[PDB]
Design a protein around this ligand. Structure first.
Ligand SMILES: *[C@@H]1O[C@H](CO)[C@@H](O[C@@H]2O[C@H](CO)[C@@H](O[C@@H]3O[C@H](CO)[C@@H](O)[C@H](O)[C@@H]3O)[C@H](O)[C@H]2NC(C)=O)[C@H](O)[C@H]1NC(C)=O
Ligand SMILES: *[C@@H]1O[C@H](CO)[C@@H](O[C@@H]2O[C@H](CO)[C@@H](O)[C@H](O)[C@H]2NC(C)=O)[C@H](O)[C@H]1NC(C)=O
Ligand SMILES: *[C@@H]1O[C@H](CO)[C@@H](O)[C@H](O)[C@H]1NC(C)=O
Ligand SMILES: *[C@@H]1O[C@H](CO)[C@@H](O)[C@H](O)[C@H]1NC(C)=O
Ligand SMILES: *[C@@H]1O[C@H](CO)[C@@H](O)[C@H](O)[C@H]1NC(C)=O
Ligand SMILES: *[C@@H]1O[C@H](CO)[C@@H](O)[C@H](O)[C@H]1NC(C)=O
Ligand SMILES: *[C@@H]1O[C@H](CO)[C@@H](O)[C@H](O)[C@H]1NC(C)=O
Ligand SMILES: *[C@@H]1O[C@H](CO)[C@@H](O)[C@H](O)[C@H]1NC(C)=O
Ligand SMILES: *[C@@H]1O[C@H](CO)[C@@H](O)[C@H](O)[C@H]1NC(C)=O
Ligand SMILES: *[C@@H]1O[C@H](CO)[C@@H](O)[C@H](O)[C@H]1NC(C)=O
Lengths: 99, 217, 149, 99, 50, 99
């Protein structure tokens, strides 16, 4: 108050010195239910696979692709990614994915 | 929606397709939860200025901190909330008497004995001062006196020279200011008493010549 | 880098022009006030207190001046004033009376009717007060006798 | 790109300063009005209608207030009014008389 | 080169807004004057000259 | 239709009704008129730049206009003079091109 009034003797009354803003304590993130998963179990757990010369090209679109279940699995020997990071797979959007 | 506020349960009903809403002031008011399908109101958080309740520095140094429009549950002697907010450093005496220091919005503060106390103002009726038999001064004698009073009528015409005001003995400054337009003419016309016209760009054009040289082959 | 300071000084000049326009508006308001004061003090004897100078106006004289008008106000100020106990209304067997062309002035035991500019004790009569309902709504009730010789 | 928004906000702040100066001028005008009302109602009984409150002034009392003056105006309002036919002047064998 | 004239016209528009606000203040003052003139001339016979 | 607007003076003798009071009632009126204004200061740094460093760094080159704005808000008129405090100087810190 002495800095606001620029005086060593403050009179009798009420003086507004500064303000007060309640800062956000938590940080919530809401989103709709994760439904209509991509059929990764159909191409990864397929009963009969094709040869290398007649490989199938399954189109994956209009679905949410959970790449966390593929990376967090010790059953796969090689999980190399080119031009993209394996961790940021769930934070990117695409138009269509071919398996 | 990237905002900041307190989410509480609402009593309104949205349409089966409307996600969020807004008030008349074009501000986000409510939003439907994407999972529970329930409407949650959005209220801006406590915004208020702090105040120091000081009974002067000549009496004592014991002061009280006053918060405006906020609740003490979110604020980091005696802690108690009031109608104008939370007051830290005072008492909560249930007595009531004349107001001494108006802290704002009802409750007042005062100094009583060695500590600062609070009390609720009743403000029954100001009409009680009518029959208070106040003293009225009735003159008895007079003395002839003269008074000289001067009231301005006209104003000296003040002109503004933007060239010398914005640019003090500078050439490139004036060269760059010449491209800002004829705003100085409008300022002078406004100072003389002529209103500025509100129209389109019928005198200023954003033209360009593209004097860039050709690159060598 | 030059246009930054140019815009800053343009904002400063806009603030100056705003101040000058507000000063011109205040000067026009003061000119209207001087005109109405001239009309009410020179062309007539105004009964307003502390309007044609300081006190009760008697006569005024206009004087020319550059960008202004000088007024020579001749008035009289209260030399000696005395405080008296006043009441909003009296009550003489109902029909509360309120003072007109003056206020109720009491010296301690008796009440009189006189104007607020000079002290002249006058007896309370019907021709000096007006009835207003009864002595219930009017806050402040004192009992006196309204004579009428 | 930053200086564009800087200039925009400077224009906004100039508008705010203009509004504040106009408010200060209006407050000074209201202070002059309160001063002349004090001088004409407390130091004298003004005959002006609806000036020292609402009605014919009898007596006024001043009261202090933060950034303002409170006036206690004691007056009387017309309880019952009656409409009458008025004329600008009369004529009694020439020499028109005005009231 | 465009933003220079943009800022100039923004200053002109700010001057226009200032003039409009001053005109609004003067109109409010004239409205108060008309109200008090109504109250002092229609509801009563004022003794003020002119 | 064409308006003739002959003379508005015809309403003078229109014998308009005038309300003459008969009885009165004592009433009190509380009126508050502002006199002084709370000193409002303007901090251009926090107003034009909200928690930004480069914004303030660029605003520092616009000059001392905030001082003039504060002086105008306090009631002090802005002086109209030449550039005796601000200079359009330059240092030309451009590096030399490699030979
Ligand atoms: C999105 O997911 C949420 C998950 O909470 C859904 O909310 C819940 O939906 C269920 C099914 O309609 C509601 O019934 C509950 O079902 C469970 C499981 O069968 C059962 O154990 C409960 O006793 C209850 O019957 C449930 O009330 C509702 N809320 C909660 C808090 O669980 C929501 O419906 C989903 N939205 C969409 C559009 O799919
Ligand atoms: C292919 O089938 C295997 C076998 O069920 C799946 O592996 C299971 O994954 C779930 C996911 O949490 C685990 O809870 C199980 O413990 C896993 N079982 C085994 C035996 O490892 C696998 O996820 C399927 N592939 C895809 C793409 O879903
Ligand atoms: C203030 O806000 C808190 C939030 O926790 C609430 O519990 C309390 O009732 C509020 N007080 C008032 C007076 O609104
Ligand atoms: C009314 O009269 C009493 C009795 O002397 C006095 O104490 C009081 O101050 C008076 N009220 C005023 C002057 O307002
Ligand atoms: C009348 O009352 C006023 C109000 O304070 C006071 O200043 C003045 O001295 C009093 N005059 C007398 C003669 O008591
Ligand atoms: C008050 O006035 C009355 C009427 O003249 C007078 O008789 C009386 O002596 C005066 N003084 C007092 C104290 O009543
Ligand atoms: C109203 O005025 C009439 C006019 O004569 C009068 O007879 C009556 O008593 C008055 N009533 C009140 C309540 O003043
Ligand atoms: C005035 O007289 C009435 C009627 O007797 C009475 O009720 C009232 O108390 C009296 N007032 C005073 C101040 O003597
Ligand atoms: C007097 O005339 C006014 C004008 O409209 C009207 O409102 C009022 O009711 C009239 N009063 C009487 C008693 O006729
Ligand atoms: C004048 O008197 C006539 C006759 O009653 C009436 O019709 C007319 O309305 C009056 N004019 C007014 C009240 O302005």
């Amino acid at each position: 108050t002495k800095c606001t009034l620029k005086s060593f003797t403050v009179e009798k009354g009420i003086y507004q010195t500064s303000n007060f803003r309640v800062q956000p304590t938590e940080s919530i993130v809401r989103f709709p239910n994760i439904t209509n998963l991509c059929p990764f179990g159909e191409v990864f757990n397929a009963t009969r696979f094709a040869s290398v010369y007649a490989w199938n090209r399954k189109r994956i679109s209009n679905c949410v692709a959970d790449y966390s279940v593929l990376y967090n699995s010790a059953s796969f020997s090689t999980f190399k990614c080119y031009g993209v990071s394996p961790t940021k797979l769930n934070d990117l959007c695409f138009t269509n994915v071919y398996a | 929606l990237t905002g900041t506020g307190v989410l509480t349960e609402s009593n309104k009903k949205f349409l089966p397709f409307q996600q969020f809403g807004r008030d008349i002031a074009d501000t986000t008011d409510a939003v439907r939860d994407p999972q529970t399908l329930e409407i949650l109101d959005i209220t801006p958080c406590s915004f208020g200025g702090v105040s120091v309740i000081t009974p002067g520095t000549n009496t004592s140094n014991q002061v009280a901190v006053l918060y405006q429009g906020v609740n003490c549950t979110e604020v980091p002697s005696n802690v108690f909330q009031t109608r104008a907010g939370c007051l830290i450093g005072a008492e909560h005496v249930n007595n009531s008497y004349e107001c001494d220091i108006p802290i704002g919005a009802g409750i007042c503060a005062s100094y009583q004995t060695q500590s600062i106390i609070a009390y609720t103002m009743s403000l029954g009726a100001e009409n009680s001062v009518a029959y208070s038999n106040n003293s009225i001064a009735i003159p008895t004698n007079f003395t002839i006196s003269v008074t000289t009073e001067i009231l301005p009528v006209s104003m000296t015409k003040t002109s503004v020279d933007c060239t010398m005001y914005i640019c003090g003995d500078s050439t490139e400054c004036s060269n760059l200011l010449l491209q800002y337009g004829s705003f100085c003419t409008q300022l002078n016309r406004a100072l003389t008493g002529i209103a500025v016209e509100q129209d389109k760009n019928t005198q200023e054009v954003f033209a360009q010549v593209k004097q860039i040289y050709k690159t060598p082959p | 880098q030059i246009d930054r300071l140019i815009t800053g000084r343009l904002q400063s000049l806009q603030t100056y022009v705003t101040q000058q326009l507000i000063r011109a508006a205040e000067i026009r308001a003061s000119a209207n006030l001087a005109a109405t004061k001239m009309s009410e003090c020179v062309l007539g004897q105004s009964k307003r207190v502390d309007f044609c100078g300081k006190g009760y106006h008697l006569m005024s004289f206009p004087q020319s001046a550059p960008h202004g008008v000088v007024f020579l106000h001749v008035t009289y100020v209260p030399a000696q004033e005395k405080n008296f106990t006043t009441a909003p209304a009296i009550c003489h067997d109902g029909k509360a009376h309120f003072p007109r062309e003056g206020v109720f002035v009491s010296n301690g035991t008796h009440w009189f009717v006189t104007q607020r500019n000079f002290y002249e004790p006058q007896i309370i009569t019907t021709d000096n007060t007006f009835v207003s309902g009864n002595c219930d709504v009017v806050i402040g009730i004192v009992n006196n006798t309204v004579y009428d010789p």
